[PDB]
């Protein structure tokens, strides 16, 4: 599923992400834009052989099992394929565990490089929430 901008904001708000650990809704939408282009089915392979999955590009070396990343952990306790569904529930819950582990949204390289310190509120302008 390829979300619209305001559609994804409303879905994110409903699942508890607005202001979660101090990050306003605009930050999560901006990170989803540059991680996956709003596409739940996006996958990308890293140099160490681990893979990134879904709307927020979650990594198989720490967070999910895909059966092909040796020695990795399954900290969110799911198969990585569940992160690709059109229902964003599993991606949201795992993301909540990630942003809580000490380093906040800095865990997402594209947030750090393209969203941090910008006007992230613009990402929800015009939306009915």
Stretch of 11-19, 30-38, 63-71, 101-109 lying at the interface with Na ion (CB under 5 A): 63-71
Tell me, yes or no, if 52 is annotated catalytic: yes
Residue 48 vs 117, nearer CB to Na ion: 48
Q: Check residue 128 and give left, alpha or beta (phi > 0: left; psi -120 to 50: alpha).
A: beta
- Contact pick of 104, 112, 116, 127 for Cl ion (by CB under 5 A): 104
35, 48, 66, 87: the active-site residue: 35
Q: What are the binding residues for substrate?
A: 101
Q: What DSSP line would sit under the chain, residue for residue?
A: -B--HHHHHHHHHHTT-TTBTTB-HHHHHHHHHHHHTTBTT-EEE-TTS-EEETTTTEETTTS-B-S-STT---TT-SBGGGGGSSSTHHHHHHHHHHTTSSSGGGGSHHHHHHTTTS-GGGGGTT---
Residue 25 vs 80, nearer CB to Na ion: 80
- Contact pick of 25, 72, 78, 83 for Na ion (by CB under 5 A): 72
Q: Which of Na ion, Cl ion, none does residue 104 bind (CB under 5 to 8 Å by kind)?
A: Cl ion
Total of residues contacting Na ion (CB under 5 A) = 4
Give me the least distance between CB of 104 and Cl ion, in Å please: 3
Q: Contact positions toward Na ion, by CB under 5 A?
A: 60, 65, 72, 74
């Amino acid at each position: 599923k390829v979300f619209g901008r305001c559609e994804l904001a409303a879905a994110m708000k409903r699942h508890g992400l607005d202001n979660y650990r101090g990050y306003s809704l605009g930050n999560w939408v901006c990170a989803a834009k540059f991680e996956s282009n709003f596409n739940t089915q996006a996958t990308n392979r890293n140099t160490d052989g681990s893979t990134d999955y879904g709307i927020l590009q979650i990594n198989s070396r720490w967070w999910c099992n895909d059966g092909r990343t040796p020695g990795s952990r399954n900290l969110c306790n799911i198969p990585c394929s569940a992160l690709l569904s059109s229902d964003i529930t599993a991606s949201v819950n795992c993301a909540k565990k990630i942003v809580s582990d000490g380093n906040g949204m800095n865990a997402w390289v594209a947030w750090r490089n393209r969203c941090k310190g910008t006007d992230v509120q613009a990402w929800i302008r015009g939306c009915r929430l």
